[PDB]
Amino acid sequence: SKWIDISQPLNNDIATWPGDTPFSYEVLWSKEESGSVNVGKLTMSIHTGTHIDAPFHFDNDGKKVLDLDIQVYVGPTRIIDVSNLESIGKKELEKFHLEGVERLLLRTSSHGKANEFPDIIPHLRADIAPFLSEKGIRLIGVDVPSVDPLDDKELAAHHQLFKHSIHILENVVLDHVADGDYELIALPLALSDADGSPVRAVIRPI
Amino acid sequence: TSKWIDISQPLNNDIATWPGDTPFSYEVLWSKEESGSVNVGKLTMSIHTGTHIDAPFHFDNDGKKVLDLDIQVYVGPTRIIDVSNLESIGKKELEKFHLEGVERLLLRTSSHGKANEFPDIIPHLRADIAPFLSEKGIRLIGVDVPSVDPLDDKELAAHHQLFKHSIHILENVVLDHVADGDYELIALPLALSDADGSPVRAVIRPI
Ligand SMILES: CC(=O)c1ccccc1N
Ligand SMILES: [Mg+2]
Ligand SMILES: [Zn+2]
Ligand SMILES: [Zn+2]
Ligand SMILES: [Zn+2]
Ligand SMILES: [Zn+2]
């Protein structure tokens, strides 16, 4: 059974957060110039395309990306539809079967345009954390750039999720995949000092 | 149990790069004190830093870019073998291993293993290795050094021949803390539309 790509393409047309570094890939040394190889240079914000946050992003004493447990980003995941909801909390999630789930991906179907930064997204309410924590959920993923509203500076959801040991994955592309169980892979790069990492997220149907 | 094991080089500002190539840089542009909410970071690097894959574009102007690459190649059963104390590695040195049904192969040269220094000399792969591995069904080869060709070679025989036989390339895996044998491997490139390679997080789990 094939792996399916649920990552946003990364190129110089991708959207970023306002005030983040624009994405740049450029060929530093071409093959004409080097005599052998095309060699690339990559400049970006960590939070561009499909990626994971580390606690250090929103907490000065938080863990950096390399201090994170890799076991969390690989394994069984459940995918659910939570479209047409302004916000998502305990109430909206109690209707789903979630027993023994370790990793949960939410399809909001809210945006899905990797080249535009949205004006508004559905966010997670802070009661979601104790609820998911209690069920054993270590990772939550959403198909939008954030778990908190776009203009919120408190980042309640970020803080609460990581206080309950739930890790965060943003900007997965879920419109071409059905609800259900899969294996997930979405590993961060081994960055010693970083606040997050882009990843290649992929899934395979159980 | 059966935990995944990291076989990637740590990426930080002391990592080595190819001579004259973009040095690696992770830096906080705007801190949480300054912004009132978030540490805002910037990542600058060469593609060919730390553990990473090559795409055919890197050495062929008409080669595929990273996103054109088949992801199924970079996930699945792999075999690890020890080829230390060899100046070069070809058919001859691999014929002593039983390699039937293998799709992905990792070679421990134990030649260098210092992520913070760029080596003066490495063991390279000879070009006869490609038909040999190709015939057996091998789609990916990995080495614990920065290149499959010698550090100063401009022809890049090994690169060209590997990809001409549909064998993909993974460089700078860290193998000294892992035993030979069978594993599941994961080493996926980032979804880079226009790039000549991608860094990866390579990990393995014992079968
Ligand atoms: C930097 C890089 O990728 C490179 C440059 C010269 C020769 C071989 C290489 N892999
Ligand atoms: Mg052309
Ligand atoms: Zn983020
Ligand atoms: Zn976030
Ligand atoms: Zn390379
Ligand atoms: Zn190479």
Side-chain angles (χ1 to χ4, degrees):
Chain A
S1 201
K2 284 196 184 294
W3 296 94
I4 299 157
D5 190 9
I6 57 160
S7 308
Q8 293 182 346
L10 296 175
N11 51 60
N12 294 4
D13 304 325
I14 191 145
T16 54
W17 277 82
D20 260 2
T21 308
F23 181 80
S24 176
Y25 175 78
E26 78 198 300
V27 178
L28 174 77
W29 294 331
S30 77
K31 179 165 182 187
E32 301 95 283
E33 175 60 40
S34 68
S36 69
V37 286
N38 294 297
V39 177
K41 186 181 155 180
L42 183 58
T43 302
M44 65 190 301
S45 173
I46 293 295
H47 303 261
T48 302
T50 310
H51 66 284
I52 66 98
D53 298 349
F56 177 58
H57 172 50
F58 52 79
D59 180 328
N60 275 339
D61 290 305
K63 284 175 315 197
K64 266 74 166 190
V65 159
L66 193 57
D67 308 331
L68 298 174
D69 194 7
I70 57 185
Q71 316 308 317
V72 176
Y73 300 95
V74 190
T77 181
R78 182 141 323 160
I79 301 194
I80 62 178
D81 190 282
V82 289
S83 50
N84 268 335
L85 293 172
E86 286 206 300
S87 76
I88 301 152
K90 185 177 201 282
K91 208 220 179 210
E92 291 76 4
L93 295 192
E94 284 181 307
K95 80 175 236 211
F96 297 96
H97 177 54
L98 297 177
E99 292 309 296
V101 164
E102 297 175 275
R103 302 167 186 83
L104 176 61
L105 304 181
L106 312 180
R107 190 192 310 93
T108 72
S109 296
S110 190
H111 188 56
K113 286 175 160 168
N115 292 356
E116 290 178 26
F117 198 77
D119 292 322
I120 187 174
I121 61 165
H123 58 276
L124 314 188
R125 304 197 298 274
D127 70 22
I128 205 168
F131 176 75
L132 298 184
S133 188
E134 221 64 77
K135 297 196 189 293
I137 290 165
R138 305 304 319 295
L139 179 153
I140 185 83
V142 299
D143 62 352
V144 289
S146 192
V147 299
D148 281 290
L150 297 184
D151 57 3
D152 168 24
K153 309 301 170 146
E154 291 311 324
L155 297 187
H158 281 78
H159 276 93
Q160 283 307 305
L161 291 168
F162 267 101
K163 192 151 142 282
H164 292 79
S165 297
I166 304 152
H167 297 234
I168 301 168
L169 168 64
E170 296 167 332
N171 284 327
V172 297
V173 179
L174 311 171
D175 260 22
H176 57 296
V177 318
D179 287 348
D181 290 333
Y182 296 84
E183 289 128 303
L184 176 59
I185 300 166
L187 286 158
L189 299 177
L191 298 158
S192 307
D193 308 304
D195 58 295
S197 169
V199 309
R200 190 70 177 274
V202 304
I203 58 176
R204 186 175 59 190
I206 292 310
Chain B
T1 189
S2 204
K3 281 199 184 293
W4 296 95
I5 299 157
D6 191 6
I7 56 162
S8 308
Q9 293 181 352
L11 296 176
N12 49 62
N13 298 3
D14 303 327
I15 193 144
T17 56
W18 275 83
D21 200 355
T22 316
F24 181 93
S25 178
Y26 176 79
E27 81 197 297
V28 179
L29 295 177
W30 205 232
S31 76
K32 183 166 181 185
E33 269 299 315
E34 301 173 307
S35 69
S37 70
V38 286
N39 289 301
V40 176
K42 189 180 155 180
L43 178 61
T44 302
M45 64 189 297
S46 174
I47 293 297
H48 304 265
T49 303
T51 309
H52 68 287
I53 64 100
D54 300 352
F57 182 57
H58 170 50
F59 53 80
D60 182 324
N61 277 334
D62 291 306
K64 286 172 315 197
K65 265 75 166 188
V66 160
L67 189 58
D68 305 333
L69 296 174
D70 192 12
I71 58 186
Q72 317 308 315
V73 182
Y74 298 97
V75 191
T78 180
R79 178 96 38 97
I80 302 192
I81 64 178
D82 190 279
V83 289
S84 49
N85 301 322
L86 293 172
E87 289 189 278
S88 79
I89 301 152
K91 185 175 200 282
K92 208 221 179 210
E93 292 76 2
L94 297 193
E95 89 195 356
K96 81 175 238 210
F97 302 97
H98 185 268
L99 290 173
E100 291 308 292
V102 169
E103 297 177 271
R104 300 167 187 79
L105 177 62
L106 306 179
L107 312 181
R108 187 191 312 94
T109 68
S110 298
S111 189
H112 187 56
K114 283 180 158 169
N116 292 357
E117 289 177 25
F118 199 78
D120 291 324
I121 186 176
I122 60 166
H124 60 277
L125 314 185
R126 302 198 297 277
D128 68 23
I129 205 168
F132 177 73
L133 299 183
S134 188
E135 260 152 294
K136 297 194 188 295
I138 290 165
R139 306 304 319 295
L140 179 151
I141 185 85
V143 300
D144 61 352
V145 291
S147 191
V148 297
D149 282 291
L151 297 183
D152 56 5
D153 168 24
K154 309 300 170 146
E155 291 309 326
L156 296 187
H159 283 77
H160 275 98
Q161 283 306 304
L162 292 168
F163 268 100
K164 189 151 142 283
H165 293 78
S166 302
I167 305 153
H168 294 238
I169 297 168
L170 167 65
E171 297 166 333
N172 286 322
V173 295
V174 178
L175 309 173
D176 259 26
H177 58 294
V178 320
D180 284 349
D182 290 337
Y183 297 83
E184 299 264 21
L185 176 60
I186 302 164
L188 285 159
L190 301 177
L192 298 159
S193 305
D194 308 304
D196 57 294
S198 168
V200 309
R201 190 71 176 273
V203 304
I204 57 177
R205 187 173 60 185
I207 283 294

